[PDB]
Amino acid sequence: QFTIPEVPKEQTSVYDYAELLSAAEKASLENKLIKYSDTTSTQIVVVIIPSTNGENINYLGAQWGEKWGIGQAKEDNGVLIILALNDKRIAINTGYGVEHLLTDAMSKRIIELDITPFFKRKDYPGGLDRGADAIFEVLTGEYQG
Numbered sequence: 001q002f003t004i005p006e007v008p009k010e011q012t013s014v015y016d017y018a019e020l021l022s023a024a025e026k027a028s029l030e031n032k033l034i035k036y037s038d039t040t041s042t043q044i045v046v047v048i049i050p051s052t053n054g055e056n057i058n059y060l061g062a063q064w065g066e067k068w069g070i071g072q073a074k075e076d077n078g079v080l081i082i083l084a085l086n087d088k089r090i091a092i093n094t095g096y097g098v099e100h101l102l103t104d105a106m107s108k109r110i111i112e113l114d115i116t117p118f119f120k121r122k123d124y125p126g127g128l129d130r131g132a133d134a135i136f137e138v139l140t141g142e143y144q145g
Contacts, residue, residue: 004063
């Protein structure tokens, strides 16, 4: 099906396989995801790949989250943001533990209203950064949409 790579030695929470981020943007986003994950008792990760190679992005993200055990040390409170850069598609995959707040509707809303407007303005790193903030808002009962 999907070829998911190995879990790297350095699990920094941001995995950029599409050469998108500057080193400083990557380090800032890693810090943000780690702090949000800590305070919300979740495991939030960002994966950027060139393409899904024709596969469904939501099913790829689910396979990726399962393979890497995202949220396994946090009672299935995993959140995976997966961007297929060349495909211009993004998905948010959630473990069973956070799905009640971060529903498919809320994840779709974050993609539509929080992330995609940055991508339309040619600000892909900015869209990922706002996506992390919007996920934190949903997890903490502060989302306004």
